Amino acid sequence: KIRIKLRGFDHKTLDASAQKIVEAARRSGAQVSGPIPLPTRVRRFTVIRGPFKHKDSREHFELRTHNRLVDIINPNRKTIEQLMTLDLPTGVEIEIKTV
């Protein structure tokens, strides 16, 4: 019933921090749908390489925003207990909602 979403710019921190919550939910009495890899939202932009006025030949950058989903079954305060405030991100945004 409990749905958690984890967005992030770094994939290595995401693929690891959203895997901790798979271990911290499985070893507390619940069935956990593993790291669901939602598609990425790549936000590119292309900037002229020079401060002057050399239109041809520039250089572009991208801001990949990754999405990862995990669902746990029963909202028992046994699994809730651990995932309550035992948070270890580096800024990774987490969404917790039940529906």
């Binding site: 770094d10 580096t90 800024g91 990774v92 945004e93």
Partner: protein, 206 residues
Amino acid sequence: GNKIHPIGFRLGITRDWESRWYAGKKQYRHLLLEDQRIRGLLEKELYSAGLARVDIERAADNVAVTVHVAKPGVVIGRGGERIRVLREELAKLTGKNVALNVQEVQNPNLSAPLVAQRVAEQIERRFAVRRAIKQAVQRVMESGAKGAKVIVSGRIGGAEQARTEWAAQGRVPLHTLRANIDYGFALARTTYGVLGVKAYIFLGEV
């Protein structure tokens, strides 16, 4: 010439970020401006420390700020000032958790920003630049470096004629990705103008 910033050229693999936080739109713009104003405010009254980095991390009103310094001499024991209101003056336009840490950069002769900054000081001391370059390189090479390279360009020793002094010992492969190459830069302000100091420090990888 034309060569890409050896830091940006890595970023992903080798050399991580310097401001590590995540946000969507309507927030990124505000938090980046604040973030940059922290870097701007710190650089001023903390230059005497000579800061190699200014790492920043966030987590909803958490704002962690790690200041790497060769010699953290300007911290002086708890209530001995140089930290108290100093790490608290940040929250005069922030008001968030101003968690300011201090790191001890062990060898300053292996920190590119510090190397270039030491050189740029010497330019303003009216030192002989070519000899200053040579020494700084060997100094870096003396402290165990796998390769080094310092570059001062323009208006050397005053004198109407922009020059470019060049020195580099050992190995500095800029094209390679598994490089671990530290890059630093510094503005030397002189009574006759402005000149830039590049500093490249290289260690192994694989």
